[PDB]
Amino acid sequence: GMLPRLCCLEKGPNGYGFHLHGEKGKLGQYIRLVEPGSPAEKAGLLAGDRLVEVNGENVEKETHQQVVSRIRAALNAVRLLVVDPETSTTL
Ligand SMILES: [Cl-]
Ligand SMILES: [Cl-]
Ligand SMILES: [Cl-]
Ligand SMILES: [Cl-]
């Protein structure tokens, strides 16, 4: 499939089960630490992924805090459009 993976997560009793990290010298936010047995894993999320959209909005050039706020404000379900940074570049 040529489209980016779209991971559709429903929040569980222990949250979504992943970490989000920025470095800022790098473009945008990255997935880390996808806990075994979590909504994140069931949805197909993988640590190393670069996060491109949250619920249909591009988050590549937003601050870490902005992206976290978007995710937290959503009503307990999020669709994360993600790419493999090794093979994917924003120009
Ligand atoms: Cl982290
Ligand atoms: Cl929405
Ligand atoms: Cl990809
Ligand atoms: Cl890039």
**Structural domains counted in the chain:** 1
Dist CA 7 CA 81 (whole Å): 6
Distance 2 CA to ligand 1 centre (A): 28
What ligand has the least distance to the C-alpha of 34? Answer: 1
- Quick one: tokens of 71? 């995710």
Which of 55, 70, 59 has its CA nearest to residue 22? 59
Domain CATH number, residue 58: 2.30.42.10
Q: Can you give the residue range of the structural domain that contains 87?
A: 1-91
- Quick one: tokens of 57? 């909005």
Resolution in Å, one decimal place: 1.1
What are the phi and psi torsion angles at 80 (to 5°)?
Answer: -110, 115
Dist CA 24 CA 64 (whole Å): 9
- Quick one: tokens of 61? 């050039």
Distance 75 CA to ligand 1 centre (A): 22
Helices (H), 1-91: 39-42, 64-73
Instruction: State the method.
Output: X-ray
Torsion of CA 33, 53, 87, 20, to 10 degrees: -20
